[PDB]
Short mmCIF file of C-alpha atoms and ligand atoms in Angstrom, two decimals:
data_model
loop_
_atom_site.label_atom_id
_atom_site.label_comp_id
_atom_site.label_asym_id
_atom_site.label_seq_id
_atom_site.Cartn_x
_atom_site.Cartn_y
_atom_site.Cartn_z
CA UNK R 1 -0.67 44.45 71.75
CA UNK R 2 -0.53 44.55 68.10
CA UNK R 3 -1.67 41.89 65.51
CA UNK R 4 -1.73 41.62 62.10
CA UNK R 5 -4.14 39.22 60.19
CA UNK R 6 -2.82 38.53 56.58
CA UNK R 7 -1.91 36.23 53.74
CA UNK R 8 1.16 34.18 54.16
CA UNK R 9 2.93 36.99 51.56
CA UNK R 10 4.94 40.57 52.22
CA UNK R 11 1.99 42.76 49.92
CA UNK R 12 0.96 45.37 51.67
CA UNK R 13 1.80 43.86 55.39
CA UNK R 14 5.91 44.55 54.49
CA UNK R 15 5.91 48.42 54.91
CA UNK R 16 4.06 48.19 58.43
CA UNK R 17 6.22 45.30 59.37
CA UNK R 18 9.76 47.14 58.73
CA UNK R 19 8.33 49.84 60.44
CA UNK R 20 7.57 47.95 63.87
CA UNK R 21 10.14 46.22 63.93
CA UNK R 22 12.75 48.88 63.34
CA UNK R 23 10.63 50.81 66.50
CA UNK R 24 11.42 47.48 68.40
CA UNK R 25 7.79 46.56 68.62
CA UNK R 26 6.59 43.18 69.12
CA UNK R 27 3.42 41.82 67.54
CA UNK R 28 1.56 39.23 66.52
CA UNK R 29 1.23 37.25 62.92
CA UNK R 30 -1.67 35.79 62.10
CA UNK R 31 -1.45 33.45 58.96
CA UNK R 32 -4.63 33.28 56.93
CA UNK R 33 -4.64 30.32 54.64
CA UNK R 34 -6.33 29.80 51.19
CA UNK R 35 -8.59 27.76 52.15
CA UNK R 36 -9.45 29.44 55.61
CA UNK R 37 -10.31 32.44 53.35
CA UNK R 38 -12.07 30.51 50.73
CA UNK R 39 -14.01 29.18 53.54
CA UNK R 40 -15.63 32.82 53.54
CA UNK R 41 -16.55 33.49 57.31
CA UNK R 42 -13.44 35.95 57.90
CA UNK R 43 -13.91 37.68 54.42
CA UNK R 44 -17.61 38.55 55.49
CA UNK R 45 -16.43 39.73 58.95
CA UNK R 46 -13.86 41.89 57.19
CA UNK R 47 -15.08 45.58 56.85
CA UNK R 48 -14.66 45.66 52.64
CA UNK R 49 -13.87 41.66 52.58
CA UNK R 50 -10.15 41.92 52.41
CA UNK R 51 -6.97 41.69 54.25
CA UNK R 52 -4.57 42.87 56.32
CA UNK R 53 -6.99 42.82 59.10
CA UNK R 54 -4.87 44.89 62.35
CA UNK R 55 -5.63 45.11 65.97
CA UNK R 56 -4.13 47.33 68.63
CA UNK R 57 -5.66 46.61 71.83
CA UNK R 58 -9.33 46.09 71.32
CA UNK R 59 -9.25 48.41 68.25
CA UNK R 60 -9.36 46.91 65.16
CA UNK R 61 -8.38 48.48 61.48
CA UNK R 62 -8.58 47.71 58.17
CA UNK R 63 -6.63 48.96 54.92
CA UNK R 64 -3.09 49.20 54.93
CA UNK R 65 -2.40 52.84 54.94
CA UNK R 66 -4.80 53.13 57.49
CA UNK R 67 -2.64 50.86 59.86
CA UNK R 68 0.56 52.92 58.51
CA UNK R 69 -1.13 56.23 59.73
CA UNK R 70 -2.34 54.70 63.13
CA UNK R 71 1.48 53.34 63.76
CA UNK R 72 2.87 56.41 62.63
CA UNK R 73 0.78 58.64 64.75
CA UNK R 74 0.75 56.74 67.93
CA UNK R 75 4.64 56.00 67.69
CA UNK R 76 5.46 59.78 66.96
CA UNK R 77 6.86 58.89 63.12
CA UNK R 78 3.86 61.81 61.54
CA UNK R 79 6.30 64.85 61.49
CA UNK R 80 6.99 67.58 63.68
CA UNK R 81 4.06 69.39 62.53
CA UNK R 82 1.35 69.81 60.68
CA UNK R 83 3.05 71.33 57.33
CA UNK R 84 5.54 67.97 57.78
CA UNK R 85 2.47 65.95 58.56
CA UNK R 86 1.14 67.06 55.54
CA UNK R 87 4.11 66.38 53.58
CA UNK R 88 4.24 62.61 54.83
CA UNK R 89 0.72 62.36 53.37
CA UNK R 90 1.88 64.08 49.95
CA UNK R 91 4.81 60.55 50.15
CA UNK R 92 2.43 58.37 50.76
CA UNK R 93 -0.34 58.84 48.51
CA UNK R 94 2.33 59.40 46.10
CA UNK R 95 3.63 56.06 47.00
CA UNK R 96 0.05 54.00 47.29
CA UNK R 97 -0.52 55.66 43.48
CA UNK R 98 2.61 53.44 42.48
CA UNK R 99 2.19 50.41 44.77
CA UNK R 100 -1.44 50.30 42.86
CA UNK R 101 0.31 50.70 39.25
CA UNK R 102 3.09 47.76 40.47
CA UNK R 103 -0.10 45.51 41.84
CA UNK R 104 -2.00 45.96 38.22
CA UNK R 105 0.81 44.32 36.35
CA UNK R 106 1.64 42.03 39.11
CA UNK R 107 -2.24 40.19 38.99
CA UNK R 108 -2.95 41.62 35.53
CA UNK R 109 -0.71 41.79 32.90
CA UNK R 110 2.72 40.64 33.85
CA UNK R 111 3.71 39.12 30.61
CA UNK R 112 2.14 41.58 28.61
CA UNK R 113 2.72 45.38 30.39
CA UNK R 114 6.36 44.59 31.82
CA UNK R 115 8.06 46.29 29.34
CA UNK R 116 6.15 49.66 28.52
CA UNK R 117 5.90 49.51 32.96
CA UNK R 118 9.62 49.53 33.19
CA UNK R 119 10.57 51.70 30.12
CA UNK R 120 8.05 54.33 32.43
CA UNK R 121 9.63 53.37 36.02
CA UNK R 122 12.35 56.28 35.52
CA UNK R 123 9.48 59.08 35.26
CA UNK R 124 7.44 57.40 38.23
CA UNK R 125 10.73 57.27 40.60
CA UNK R 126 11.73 60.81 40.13
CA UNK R 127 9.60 62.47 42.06
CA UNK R 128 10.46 60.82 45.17
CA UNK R 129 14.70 61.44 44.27
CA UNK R 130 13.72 65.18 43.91
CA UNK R 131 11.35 65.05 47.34
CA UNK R 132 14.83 63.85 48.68
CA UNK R 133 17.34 66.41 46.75
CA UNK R 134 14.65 69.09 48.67
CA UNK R 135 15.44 67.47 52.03
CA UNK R 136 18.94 67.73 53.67
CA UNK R 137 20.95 67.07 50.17
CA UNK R 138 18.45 63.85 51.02
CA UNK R 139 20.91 62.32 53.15
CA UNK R 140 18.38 62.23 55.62
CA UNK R 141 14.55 60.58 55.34
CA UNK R 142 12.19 61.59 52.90
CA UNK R 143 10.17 64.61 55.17
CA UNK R 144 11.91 66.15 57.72
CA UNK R 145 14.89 64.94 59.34
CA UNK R 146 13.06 62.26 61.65
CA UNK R 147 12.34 59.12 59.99
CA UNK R 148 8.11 58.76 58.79
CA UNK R 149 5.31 55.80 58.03
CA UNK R 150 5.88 57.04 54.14
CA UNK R 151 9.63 56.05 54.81
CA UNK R 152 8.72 52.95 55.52
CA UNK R 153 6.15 52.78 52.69
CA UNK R 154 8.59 54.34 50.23
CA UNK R 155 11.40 51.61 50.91
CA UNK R 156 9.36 48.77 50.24
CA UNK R 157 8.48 50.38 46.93
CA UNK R 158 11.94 51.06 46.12
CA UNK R 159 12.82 47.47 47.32
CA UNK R 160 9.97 45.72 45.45
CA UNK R 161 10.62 47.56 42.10
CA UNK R 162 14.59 46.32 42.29
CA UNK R 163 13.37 43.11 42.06
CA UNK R 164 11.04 43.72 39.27
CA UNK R 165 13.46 45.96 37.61
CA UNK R 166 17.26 45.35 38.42
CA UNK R 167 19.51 48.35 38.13
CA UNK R 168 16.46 50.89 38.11
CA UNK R 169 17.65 52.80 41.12
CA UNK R 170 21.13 53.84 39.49
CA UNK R 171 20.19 56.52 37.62
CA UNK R 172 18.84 58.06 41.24
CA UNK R 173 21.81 58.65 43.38
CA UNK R 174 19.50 60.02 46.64
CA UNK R 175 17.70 57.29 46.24
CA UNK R 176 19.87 54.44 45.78
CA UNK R 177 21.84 55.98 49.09
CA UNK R 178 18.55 56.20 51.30
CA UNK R 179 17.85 53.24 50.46
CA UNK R 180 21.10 51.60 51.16
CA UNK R 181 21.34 53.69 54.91
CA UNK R 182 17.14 53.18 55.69
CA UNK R 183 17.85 49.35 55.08
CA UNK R 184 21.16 49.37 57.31
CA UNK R 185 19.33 50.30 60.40
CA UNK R 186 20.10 47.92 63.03
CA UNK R 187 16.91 46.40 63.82
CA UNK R 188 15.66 47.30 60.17
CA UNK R 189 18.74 44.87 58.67
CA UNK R 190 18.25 42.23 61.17
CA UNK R 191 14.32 42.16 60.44
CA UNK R 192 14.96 42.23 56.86
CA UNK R 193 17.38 39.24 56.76
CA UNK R 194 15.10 37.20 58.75
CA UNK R 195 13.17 34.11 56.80
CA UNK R 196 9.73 35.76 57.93
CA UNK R 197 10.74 38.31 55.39
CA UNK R 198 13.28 36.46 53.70
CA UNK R 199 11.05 33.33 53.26
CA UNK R 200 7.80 35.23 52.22
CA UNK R 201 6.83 35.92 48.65
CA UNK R 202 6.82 39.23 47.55
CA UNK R 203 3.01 38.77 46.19
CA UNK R 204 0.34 36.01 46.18
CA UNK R 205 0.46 34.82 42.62
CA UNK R 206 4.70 34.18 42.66
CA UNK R 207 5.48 37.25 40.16
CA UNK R 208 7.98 39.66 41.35
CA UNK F 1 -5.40 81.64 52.07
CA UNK F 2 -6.04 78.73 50.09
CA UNK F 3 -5.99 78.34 45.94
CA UNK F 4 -7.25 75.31 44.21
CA UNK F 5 -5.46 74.61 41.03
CA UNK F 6 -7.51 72.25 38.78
CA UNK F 7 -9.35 71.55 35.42
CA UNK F 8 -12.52 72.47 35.11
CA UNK F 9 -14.57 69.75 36.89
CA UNK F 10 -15.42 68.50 39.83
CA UNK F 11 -13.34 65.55 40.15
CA UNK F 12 -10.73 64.87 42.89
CA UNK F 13 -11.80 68.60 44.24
CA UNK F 14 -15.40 68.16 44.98
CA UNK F 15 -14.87 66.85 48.20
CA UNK F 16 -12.18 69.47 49.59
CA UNK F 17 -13.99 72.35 48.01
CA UNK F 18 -17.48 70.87 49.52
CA UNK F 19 -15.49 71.15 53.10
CA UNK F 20 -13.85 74.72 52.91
CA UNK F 21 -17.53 75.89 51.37
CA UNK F 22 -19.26 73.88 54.70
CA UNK F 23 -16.62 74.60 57.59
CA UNK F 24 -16.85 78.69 55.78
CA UNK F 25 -12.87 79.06 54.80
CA UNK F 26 -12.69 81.31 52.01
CA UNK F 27 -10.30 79.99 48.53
CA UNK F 28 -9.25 81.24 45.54
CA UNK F 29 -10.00 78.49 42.21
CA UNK F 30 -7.47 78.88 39.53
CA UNK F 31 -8.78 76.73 36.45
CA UNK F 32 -6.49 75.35 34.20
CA UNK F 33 -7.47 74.75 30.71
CA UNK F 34 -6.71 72.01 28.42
CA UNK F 35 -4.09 73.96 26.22
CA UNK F 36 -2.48 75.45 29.51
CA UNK F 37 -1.81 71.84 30.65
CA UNK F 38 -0.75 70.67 26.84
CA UNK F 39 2.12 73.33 26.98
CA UNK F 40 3.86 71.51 29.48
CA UNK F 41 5.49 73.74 32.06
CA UNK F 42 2.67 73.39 34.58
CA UNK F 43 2.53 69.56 34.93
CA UNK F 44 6.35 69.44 34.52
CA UNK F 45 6.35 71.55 37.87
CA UNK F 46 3.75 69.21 39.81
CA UNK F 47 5.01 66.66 41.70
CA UNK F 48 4.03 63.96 40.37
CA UNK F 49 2.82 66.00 37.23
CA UNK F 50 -0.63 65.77 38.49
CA UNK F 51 -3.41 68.23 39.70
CA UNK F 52 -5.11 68.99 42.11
CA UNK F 53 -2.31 71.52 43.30
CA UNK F 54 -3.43 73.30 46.45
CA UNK F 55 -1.59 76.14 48.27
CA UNK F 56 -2.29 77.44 52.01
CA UNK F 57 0.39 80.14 52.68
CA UNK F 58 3.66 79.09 51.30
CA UNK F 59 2.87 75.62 51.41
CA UNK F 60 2.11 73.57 48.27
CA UNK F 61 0.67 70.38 48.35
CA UNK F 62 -0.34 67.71 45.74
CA UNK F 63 -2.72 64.52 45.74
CA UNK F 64 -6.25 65.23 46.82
CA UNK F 65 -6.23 63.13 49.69
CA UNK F 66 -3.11 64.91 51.29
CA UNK F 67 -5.41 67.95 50.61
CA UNK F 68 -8.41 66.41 52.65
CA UNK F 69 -6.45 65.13 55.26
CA UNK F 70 -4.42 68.83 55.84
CA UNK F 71 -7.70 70.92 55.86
CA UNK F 72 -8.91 67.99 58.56
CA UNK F 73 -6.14 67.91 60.26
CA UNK F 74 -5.88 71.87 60.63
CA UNK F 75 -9.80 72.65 61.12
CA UNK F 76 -10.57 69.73 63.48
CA UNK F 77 -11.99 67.18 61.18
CA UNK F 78 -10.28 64.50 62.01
CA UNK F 79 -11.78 62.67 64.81
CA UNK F 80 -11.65 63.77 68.33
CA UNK F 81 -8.61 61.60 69.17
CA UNK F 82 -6.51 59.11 68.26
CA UNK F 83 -8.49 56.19 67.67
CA UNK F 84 -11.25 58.26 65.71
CA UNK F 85 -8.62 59.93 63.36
CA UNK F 86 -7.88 55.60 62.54
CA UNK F 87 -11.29 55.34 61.78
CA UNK F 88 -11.75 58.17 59.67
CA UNK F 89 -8.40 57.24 58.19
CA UNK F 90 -10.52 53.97 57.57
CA UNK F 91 -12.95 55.10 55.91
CA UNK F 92 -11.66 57.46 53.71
CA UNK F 93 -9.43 54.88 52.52
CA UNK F 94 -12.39 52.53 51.50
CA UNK F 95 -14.14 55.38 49.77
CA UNK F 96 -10.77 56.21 47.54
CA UNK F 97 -10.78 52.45 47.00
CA UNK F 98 -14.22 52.97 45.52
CA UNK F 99 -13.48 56.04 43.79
CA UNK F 100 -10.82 54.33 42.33
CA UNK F 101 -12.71 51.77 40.46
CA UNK F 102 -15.36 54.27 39.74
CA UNK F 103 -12.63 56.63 37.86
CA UNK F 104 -11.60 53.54 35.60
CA UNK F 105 -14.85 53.07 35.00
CA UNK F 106 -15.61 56.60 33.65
CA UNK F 107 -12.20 56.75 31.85
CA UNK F 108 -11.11 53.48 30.86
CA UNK F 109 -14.73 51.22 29.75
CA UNK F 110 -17.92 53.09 30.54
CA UNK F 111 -20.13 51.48 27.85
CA UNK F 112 -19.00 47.99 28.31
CA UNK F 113 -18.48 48.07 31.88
CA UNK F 114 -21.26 49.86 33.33
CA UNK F 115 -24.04 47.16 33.46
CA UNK F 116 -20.98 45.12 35.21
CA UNK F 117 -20.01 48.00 37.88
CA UNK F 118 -23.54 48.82 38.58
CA UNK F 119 -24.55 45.01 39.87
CA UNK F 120 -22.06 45.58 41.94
CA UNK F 121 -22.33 48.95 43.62
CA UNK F 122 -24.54 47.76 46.50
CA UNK F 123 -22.05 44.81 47.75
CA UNK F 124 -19.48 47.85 47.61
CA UNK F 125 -21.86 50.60 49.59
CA UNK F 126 -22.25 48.00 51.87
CA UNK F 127 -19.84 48.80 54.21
CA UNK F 128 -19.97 52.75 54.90
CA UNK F 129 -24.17 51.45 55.38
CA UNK F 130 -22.49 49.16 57.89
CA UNK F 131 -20.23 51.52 59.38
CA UNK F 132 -23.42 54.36 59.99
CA UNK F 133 -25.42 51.36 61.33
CA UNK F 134 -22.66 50.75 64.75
CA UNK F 135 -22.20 55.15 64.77
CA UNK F 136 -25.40 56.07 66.93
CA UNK F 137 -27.93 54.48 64.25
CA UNK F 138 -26.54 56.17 62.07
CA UNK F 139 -27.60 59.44 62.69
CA UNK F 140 -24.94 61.67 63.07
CA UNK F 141 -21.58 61.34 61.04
CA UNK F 142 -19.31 58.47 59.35
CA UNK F 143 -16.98 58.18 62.94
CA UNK F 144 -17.88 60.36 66.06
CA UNK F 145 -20.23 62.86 66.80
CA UNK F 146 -18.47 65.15 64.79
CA UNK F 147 -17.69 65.69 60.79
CA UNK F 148 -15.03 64.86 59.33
CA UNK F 149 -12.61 64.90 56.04
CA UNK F 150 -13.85 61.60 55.42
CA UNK F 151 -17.31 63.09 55.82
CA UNK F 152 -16.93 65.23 52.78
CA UNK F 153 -14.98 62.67 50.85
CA UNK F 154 -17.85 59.49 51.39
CA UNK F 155 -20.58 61.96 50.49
CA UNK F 156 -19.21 63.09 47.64
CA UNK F 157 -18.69 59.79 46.39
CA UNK F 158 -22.85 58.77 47.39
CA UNK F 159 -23.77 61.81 45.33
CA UNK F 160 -21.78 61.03 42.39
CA UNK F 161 -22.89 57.42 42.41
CA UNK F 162 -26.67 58.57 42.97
CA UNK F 163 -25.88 60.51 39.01
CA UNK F 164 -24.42 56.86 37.89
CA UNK F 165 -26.74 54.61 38.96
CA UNK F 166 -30.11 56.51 40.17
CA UNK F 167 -31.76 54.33 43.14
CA UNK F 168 -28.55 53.12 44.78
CA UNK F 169 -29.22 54.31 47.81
CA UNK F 170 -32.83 52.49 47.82
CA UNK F 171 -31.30 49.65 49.11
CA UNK F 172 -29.68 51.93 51.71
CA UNK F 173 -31.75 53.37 54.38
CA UNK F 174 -29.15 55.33 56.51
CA UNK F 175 -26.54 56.50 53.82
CA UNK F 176 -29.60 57.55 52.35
CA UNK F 177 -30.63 59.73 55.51
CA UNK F 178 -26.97 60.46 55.19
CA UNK F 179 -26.53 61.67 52.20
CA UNK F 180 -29.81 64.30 52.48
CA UNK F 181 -28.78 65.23 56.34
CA UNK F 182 -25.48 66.50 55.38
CA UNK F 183 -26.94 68.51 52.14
CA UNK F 184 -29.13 70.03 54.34
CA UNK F 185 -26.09 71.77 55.89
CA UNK F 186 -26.95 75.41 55.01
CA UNK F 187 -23.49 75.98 53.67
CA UNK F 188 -22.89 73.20 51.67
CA UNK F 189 -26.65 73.76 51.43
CA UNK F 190 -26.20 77.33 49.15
CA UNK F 191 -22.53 75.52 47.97
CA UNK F 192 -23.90 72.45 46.26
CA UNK F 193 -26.68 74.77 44.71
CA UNK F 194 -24.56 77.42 43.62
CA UNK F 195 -22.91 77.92 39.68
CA UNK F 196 -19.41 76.97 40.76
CA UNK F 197 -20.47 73.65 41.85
CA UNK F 198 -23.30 73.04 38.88
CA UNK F 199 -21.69 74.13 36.42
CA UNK F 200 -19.04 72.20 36.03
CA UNK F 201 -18.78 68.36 35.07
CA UNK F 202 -18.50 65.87 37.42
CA UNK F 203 -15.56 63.98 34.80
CA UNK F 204 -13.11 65.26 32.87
CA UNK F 205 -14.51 63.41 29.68
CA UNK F 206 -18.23 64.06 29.69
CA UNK F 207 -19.07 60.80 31.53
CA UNK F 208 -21.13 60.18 34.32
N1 GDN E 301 -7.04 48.97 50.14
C1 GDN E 301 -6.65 47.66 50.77
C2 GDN E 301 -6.39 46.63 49.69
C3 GDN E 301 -6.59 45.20 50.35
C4 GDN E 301 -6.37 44.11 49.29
O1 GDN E 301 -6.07 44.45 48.12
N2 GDN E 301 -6.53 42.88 49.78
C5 GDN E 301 -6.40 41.66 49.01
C6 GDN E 301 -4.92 41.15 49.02
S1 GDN E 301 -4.55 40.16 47.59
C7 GDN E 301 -4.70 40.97 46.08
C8 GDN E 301 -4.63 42.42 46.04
C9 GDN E 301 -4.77 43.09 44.83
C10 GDN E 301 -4.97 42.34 43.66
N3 GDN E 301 -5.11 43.03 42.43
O2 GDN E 301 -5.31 42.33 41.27
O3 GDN E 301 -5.07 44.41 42.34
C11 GDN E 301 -5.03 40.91 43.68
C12 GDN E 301 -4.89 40.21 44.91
N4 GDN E 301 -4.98 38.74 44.80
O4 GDN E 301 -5.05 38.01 45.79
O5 GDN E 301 -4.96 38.31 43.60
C13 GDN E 301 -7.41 40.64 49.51
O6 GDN E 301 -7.64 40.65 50.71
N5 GDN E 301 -8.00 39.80 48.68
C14 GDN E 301 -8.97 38.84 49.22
C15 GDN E 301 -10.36 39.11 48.79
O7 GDN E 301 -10.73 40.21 48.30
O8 GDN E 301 -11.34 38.19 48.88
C16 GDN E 301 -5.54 47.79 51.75
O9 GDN E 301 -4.73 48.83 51.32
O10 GDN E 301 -5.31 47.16 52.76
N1 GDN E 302 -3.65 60.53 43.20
C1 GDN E 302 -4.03 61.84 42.57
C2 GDN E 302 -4.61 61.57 41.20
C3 GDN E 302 -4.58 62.91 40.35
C4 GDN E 302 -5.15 62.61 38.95
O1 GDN E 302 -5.62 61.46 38.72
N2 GDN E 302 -5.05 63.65 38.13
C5 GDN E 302 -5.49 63.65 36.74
C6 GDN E 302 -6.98 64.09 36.62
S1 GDN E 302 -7.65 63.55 35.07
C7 GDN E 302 -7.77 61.83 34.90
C8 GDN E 302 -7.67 61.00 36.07
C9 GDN E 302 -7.75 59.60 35.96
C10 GDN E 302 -7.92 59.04 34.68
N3 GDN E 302 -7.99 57.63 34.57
O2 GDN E 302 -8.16 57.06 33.34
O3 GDN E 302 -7.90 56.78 35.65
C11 GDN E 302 -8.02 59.85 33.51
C12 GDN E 302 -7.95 61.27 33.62
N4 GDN E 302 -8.07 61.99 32.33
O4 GDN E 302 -7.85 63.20 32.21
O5 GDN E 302 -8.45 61.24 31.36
C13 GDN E 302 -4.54 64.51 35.91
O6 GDN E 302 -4.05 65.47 36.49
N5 GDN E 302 -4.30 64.21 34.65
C14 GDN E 302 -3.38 65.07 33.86
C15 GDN E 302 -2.17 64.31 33.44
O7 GDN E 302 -1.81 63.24 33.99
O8 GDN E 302 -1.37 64.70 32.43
C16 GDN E 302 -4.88 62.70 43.45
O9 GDN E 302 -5.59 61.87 44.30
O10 GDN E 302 -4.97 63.89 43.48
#
């Protein structure tokens, strides 16, 4: 079965998450402590000493996007080809560049870079409302009109930066929509408003 | 065919071009100089107003990563099946990772931060020494019997290093077998030897 090693937070576990449970799989959390980290055994057994740690059967992964790509290939959410395959990639990476700017202030200069981050949110969001406006009018997912691991990826982005910056998806109509009918899915909404999500901070140091 | 749109340097393209010149795809480089990208129109039309830009047919793709993983996933570089396409997913992940602090290192603090980043290259070679180590002793490729993307990608990064911080690979027996076993390919042989690889920087700014 599936199970994912991590720190009691969302991070970079909450994309891969939403995307197993809205495919109605079933796995396993493993909570990783502080202290059961700082005791440094697991680190050193990691591959590049961090978390999430993942196992599928008796394969084991590290780094999330690897873990996105592994779900989305095995679980048929890659594209119908490879020139929509490709195009997932083009979401993600575009995504991870973002999550990685949102982490830096997060654990680095909160305080100090919110302002200049949000005053440049608008021009870092617009690619992905034009990816959709390209797509189906975007009233569909973000490549292709089957739903992708960069969907997945891309909502949690778009969900993390509401909280960090209210209001900053209504300027993006395609966006604010998908984001609104991705997060109505049936098994999506109910894993959503459950306290495992509900109940877990957004990051490890309590700044959203 | 394929066209490479980029600046002048090796960059976020010496991996890709080093695996079209190897696997003996024939591409078309279209250099962009520094007042071409100053007027505006071409970075206003990428993505996420960004290059590389890379075309194959009608298709245009951004992020050099997306890039990688198309030309692996269309020319069988990309693991023999599903589990090896994870772990080359893995590992190309942990060399961007690298890359990633190795770019802000270059850009954003060379002179103060180099002593810093070079005490701790071998804690973050580690792993890919690690990961040749459990492949065969180490004497084939990254994952499988086979290349792949992540191949091209992780050697790149070695050679680039090597330029950084001569002796690195001292401490590293097999990526240092690696790293002169995959050289020795005759085509990327004749490619890493040739003026359109030499003669251009490895950065953007001089560094290295
Ligand atoms: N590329 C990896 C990134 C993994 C990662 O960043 N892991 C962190 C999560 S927390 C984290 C992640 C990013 C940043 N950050 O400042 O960029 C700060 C924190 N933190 O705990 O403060 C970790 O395991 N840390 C434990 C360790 O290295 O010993 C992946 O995508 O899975
Ligand atoms: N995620 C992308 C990243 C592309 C990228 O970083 N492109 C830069 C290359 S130069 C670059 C890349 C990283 C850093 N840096 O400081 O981290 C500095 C520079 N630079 O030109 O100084 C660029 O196009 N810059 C033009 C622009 O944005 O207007 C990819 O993997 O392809």
């Amino acid at each position: 079965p599936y199970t994912v090693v991590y720190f009691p937070v969302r991070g970079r576990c909450a994309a891969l998450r939403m995307l197993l449970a809205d495919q109605g799989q079933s796995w396993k959390e493993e909570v990783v402590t502080v202290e059961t980290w700082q005791e440094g055994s697991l680190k050193a057994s990691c591959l590049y000493g961090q978390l999430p740690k993942f196992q599928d059967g008796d394969l084991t992964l590290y780094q999330s996007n690897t873990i996105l790509r592994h779900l989305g290939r095995t679980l048929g959410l890659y594209g119908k080809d490879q020139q929509e395959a490709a195009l997932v990639d083009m979401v993600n990476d575009g995504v991870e560049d973002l999550r990685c700017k949102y982490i830096s202030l997060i654990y680095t200069n909160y305080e100090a870079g919110k302002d200049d981050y949000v005053k440049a949110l608008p021009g870092q969001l617009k690619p992905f409302e034009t990816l959709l406006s390209q797509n189906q009018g975007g009233k569909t997912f973000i490549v292709g009109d089957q739903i992708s691991f960069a969907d997945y990826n891309l909502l949690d982005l778009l969900l993390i930066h509401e909280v960090l910056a209210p209001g900053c998806l209504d300027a993006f109509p395609l966006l604010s929509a998908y984001v609104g009918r991705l997060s109505a899915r049936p098994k999506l909404k109910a894993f959503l408003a459950s306290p495992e999500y509900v109940n877990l901070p957004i990051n490890g140091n309590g700044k959203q």
